[PDB]
Amino acid sequence: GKVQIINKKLDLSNVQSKCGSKDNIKHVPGGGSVQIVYKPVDLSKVTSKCGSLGNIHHKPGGGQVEVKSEKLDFKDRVQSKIGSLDNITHVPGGGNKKIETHKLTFRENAKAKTD
Amino acid sequence: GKVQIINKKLDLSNVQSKCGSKDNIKHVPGGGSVQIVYKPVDLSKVTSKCGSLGNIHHKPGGGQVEVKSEKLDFKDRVQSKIGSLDNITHVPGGGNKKIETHKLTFRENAKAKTD
Amino acid sequence: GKVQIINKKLDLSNVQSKCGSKDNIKHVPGGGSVQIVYKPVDLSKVTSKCGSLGNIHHKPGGGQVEVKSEKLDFKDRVQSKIGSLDNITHVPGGGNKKIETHKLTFRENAKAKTD
Amino acid sequence: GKVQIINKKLDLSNVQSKCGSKDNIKHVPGGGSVQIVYKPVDLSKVTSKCGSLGNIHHKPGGGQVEVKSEKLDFKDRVQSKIGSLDNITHVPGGGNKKIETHKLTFRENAKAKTD
Amino acid sequence: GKVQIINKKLDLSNVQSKCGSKDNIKHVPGGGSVQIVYKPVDLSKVTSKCGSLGNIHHKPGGGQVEVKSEKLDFKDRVQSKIGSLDNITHVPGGGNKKIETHKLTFRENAKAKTD
């Protein structure tokens, strides 16, 4: 008799992974200014295969953000008067039940009964 | 008799991993200023294979953020008067039940009964 | 008889790992200033394989943030009057039950009964 | 009879590891100043394999942050008057139960009964 | 009879390790100043393998932060008047139960009963 359960070469990478973003970006120059936010997310997969005489050239590119200003001149007065930007009055209440569950199970059961 | 449970070459990397971001970015220059935020996330996989005479060139690129200003001139007065930026009045209350659960189990059971 | 449970070559790296970020960035130059934040996260995997006469060149690139200013001139007065930036009045209350659970179990059970 | 439980070559590095960041960065130059924050996180894996006549060149790059200013001139008066930056009045209360649990178990049970 | 439990070549490095950061960085130059924070975290793994005639060149790069100023001139008066930066009034209360638990167990049980 033979009872076999064979699992091999399973790819379960990046399961239930939180790699996002949540930003509150505000920018009030009142003049000549540059603001840059650079938050890339990469979850790709690359596979290459060769045999005997081979040659693999894996040189991928990358992101490029460039800001250039050959000339910029300001004259007379530059002013910026600010009283407030964000006025928030949040008054919550009550009993809030927040439950989160993440599960990942691998259950294997084998049994052999004979005489 | 033979009861076998064979598990081999399982990839379970970066499971339930929190690698995100949560920022509150504010920038009030009132003049000539540069603000840069650089938070990249990389979770990629790269595989290369060769046999006998081979050659692998793994030279990937990278992010590039550049800011250039050949000339910038300011004249007369530059002013920036600020009273407040964020006015928040948060008054929560009550009993809040926050429960989080992350699980990852590998259960294997083998049994053989005979005479 | 033979009861066997064979587990080999399992990759479970970076499981339930908290490598994120949470920042509160504020910048009020009132003039010519540069602010840079550099928080990259790298969780990638790279694999290369060769046999007999081989050559592997693993020279990946890196992030590059550059700020250049050939000329910048300020004239007359530069002023920056600030009263307040953040005004927060937080008044919570009540009994809050916060429970977090992270689990990772490997249970293997083998049994053989015979005469 | 033979009851065997064989576990070999298991990779469980960096499990439930807290290597993140939590910063409160504020910068109020009132003039010409540079502020740089450099907090990179690296959790990658690199594998190379060769046999007989081989050559491995593992020279990865690194992060590079550069700030350059060929010329910067200030004239007349530069002033910066500050009353306050952060005004926080936090008044919590009540009995808060905060419980955290991290577990990692390896349970193996083998038994053989015969006559 | 033979009851065997064989565990070999298990990698469990950096499990439940707290190597993060928590900073409160404030910088109020009121002039020409540079502030640099350099807190990198490295938890990577590198593996190289060769046989018989071989050559391994493991020369990875490193982080590089550079600030340069060819010329910077200040004229007339430079002033910086500060009353306060952080005004915090924290009044907590009540009985707070904070419990943390980190566990890592390796339980192996073997038993053989015969006549």
Residues of D in contact with E16 (CB under 8 A): 15-17, 102, 104
| Chains within contact range of chain D (3+ C-beta pairs < 8 Å) | C, E
Q: Looking at the complex, report in whole angstroms how far the Cα of residue B9 sits from the nearest Cα belonging to chain C.
A: 5
> Cα-atom radius of gyration of chain B, to the nearest Å?
29
Provide, as residue numbers in chain A, all residues whose Cβ is less than 8 Å from the Cβ of B49. 48-50
Cα gap D84→B82, rounded to integer Å? 11
Distance from CA of C85 to the nearest CA of B (A): 5
- A contacts of B31 (beta carbons < 8 Å): 30-33, 78
Chain B CB contacts of A20 under 8 Å are 20
Half-sphere exposure for D40 (CA within 13 Å, toward CB): 23
3-state secondary structure of B84: coil
Are the CB atoms for C89 and D89 separated by under 8 Å? Answer: yes
SS3 E90: strand
Chains C and D touch (3+ CB pairs under 8 A): yes
**CA dist A98 → B100, D73, D95 (Å):** 8, 56, 19
Q: Please, which residues bridge with residue D20 across strands?
A: none
Give E78's DSSP letter: B
Distance from C-alpha of D70 to C-alpha of D65, rounded to nearest angstrom:
17
Residue of A nearest to B76 (CA): A76
C9 close to B7: Cβ distance less than 8 angstroms:
no
**The two three-digit tokens of residue D88, written as one number:** 């926080």
At C115, is the secondary structure helix, strand, or coil?
A: coil
The nearest CA of chain D is from the CA of C63 a distance in Å of 5
Q: How far is B17 from chain A (nearest CA, A)?
A: 5
Chain D residues within an 8 Å CB radius of C112 = 1, 3, 111-114
Beta bridge partners of E34: D34
Report CB contact under 8 Å: C71, D71: yes
Q: For residue C72, what are the CA distances in angstroms to A80, B32, D114?
A: 20, 9, 90
Separation of alpha carbons D109 and E25, rounded Å = 52
User: Are the C-beta atoms of residues C67 and B36 closer than 8 Å to each other?
Assistant: yes
Residues D31-67 as b or e (16 or more Cβ within 10 Å = b): bbbbbbbbbbbbbbbbbbbbbebbbbbbebbbbbbbb
Closest CA to D25 of E21, A83, C81, A14: E21
Subunits adjacent to chain B (3 or more Cβ pairs under 8 Å): A, C
User: DSSP for E15-60?
Assistant: TT-B--EEEEEEE--SSS-EEEEE--EE--EEEEE--SS--EEE--
Experiment used for this model: cryo-EM
- DSSP H helices, C1-105, are none
* A75: number of Cβ within 10 Å: 10
- Give the number of C-alpha atoms closer than 13 A to the C-alpha of residue E41, restricted to the C-beta side: 25
Residue of A106, A56, E24 lying closest to C46 (CA atoms): A56
Query: What does the DSSP 8-state code read for residue A14?
Result: T
Question: Residue B100: closest CA among chain A residues belongs to which residue?
Answer: A100
HSE-CB for A115 with a 13 A CA cutoff: 0
A59's CB contacts (< 8 A; 6+ apart) are: B57, B58, B59, B60, B61
Q: Which residues, 6+ apart, have CB-to-CB distance to D111 below 8 Å?
A: C110, C111, C112, D3, E3, E110, E111, E112, E113
Three-class DSSP labels, chain D = CCEEEEEEEEECCCCCCECCEEEEEEECCCCCCEEEEECCEECCEEEEECCCCCCEEECCCCCEEEEEECCEECCCCECCEECCCEEEEECCCCCCEEEEEECCEEEEEEEEECC
Nearest CB to C33; choose among D34, D87, D89: D34
Calpha distance C49→B56 (Å, rounded): 9
Q: Say how far apart CA C20 and CA B106 lie, in whole Å.
A: 27
Distance CA E32, CA B106 (A): 59
The answer for D 78-107 residues in CB contact with C (under 8 A) is: 78-107
Question: Smallest Cα–Cα separation from C89: which of A88, A92, A83, A84?
Answer: A88
Write out chain A residues lying below 8 Å of B4, CB-based: 2-6, 110
CB count in 10 Å sphere of residue E105: 10
Distance in angstroms (rounded) separating the CA atoms of residues C36 and D27: 11
Tell me which residue in A1, A74, A88 faces B1 most closely, judged by beta carbons.
A1
Helix (H) or strand (E) run with residue E65 in it: strand E64-69
E2 and D5 in contact by Cβ < 8 A? no
φ, ψ of residue B9 in degrees (nearest 5): 60, 60
CA distances from B6 to A69, C5, E76 (A): 63, 6, 80
Nearest Cα of chain B lies from the Cα of C77 at a distance, in angstroms, of: 5
Q: How far is CA B77 from CA A74, C74, C80, C81, C111, in A?
A: 10, 9, 11, 14, 86
Grouping H, G, I as helix, E, B as strand and the rest as coil, residue B64 is strand
**Cβ distance of D29 and C33 shorter than 8 Å:** yes
Burial of C99: CB neighbours in 10 Å, binned 0-12, 13-18, 19+: middle
**Residue A102 φ then ψ, to 5°:** -125, 125
CA atoms of C111 and B108, how far apart (whole Å): 12
**Of the candidates D67, D25, B26, the residue with the CA atom closest to the CA atom of residue C34:** D67
* CA E58 – CA E48 distance, rounded (Å): 9
Q: Which tokens go with D81? A: 């008057």
Which residues are within 8 A (CB) of B26 and not within 5 positions of it... i.e. 6 or more apart? A26, A27, A85, B85, B86, C25, C26, C27
CB-based contact C38 D42, cutoff 8 Å: no
Nearest CA distance, B45 vs chain A (angstrom): 5
Neighbours of C29 (CB within 10 A): 33
* DSSP structure class, residue A78: B
CA gap B3, A2 in Å, rounded? 6
Q: Contacts of residue B85 in chain C, CB cutoff 8 Å? A: 26, 84-86
- Rounded CA separation C11/C18 (Å): 18
Reduce the DSSP state of residue B3 to 3 states and report it. Answer: strand
What residue type is D34 in one-letter code?
Answer: V
Put simply, the chain E residues between 28 and 57 with a CB less than 8 A from any chain D CB are 28-57
Q: Are strands B34-38 and D3-11 parallel, antiparallel or unpaired?
A: unpaired
What is the spatial distance between Cα C16 and Cα A107, in angstroms, rounded to a whole number? 20
Query: Are A36 and B65 spatial neighbours (Cβ–Cβ below 8 Å)?
Result: yes
C-alpha distance from E30 to closest chain D C-alpha (Å): 5
Which of chain B's residues have a Cβ under 8 Å away from the Cβ of A107? 105, 107
> How far A7 CA lies from chain B's nearest CA (Å)?
5
Provide the pairing of β-strand B21-27 with C21-27. parallel
- Cα-trace Rg, chain C: 29
Count of CA atoms in the C-beta half-sphere (13 A) of B111: 7
Write out the two tokens for C52.
């007999």
User: For residues D66 and E15, what is the distance between their CA atoms, to the nearest angstrom?
Assistant: 35
- DSSP character for B78? B
Contacting residues of B for A1, CB less than 8 Å apart: 1-2
Choose the closest CB to B48 out of A24, A58, A104: A58
Nearest to C59 by CA among B47, A43, B49, A57: A57
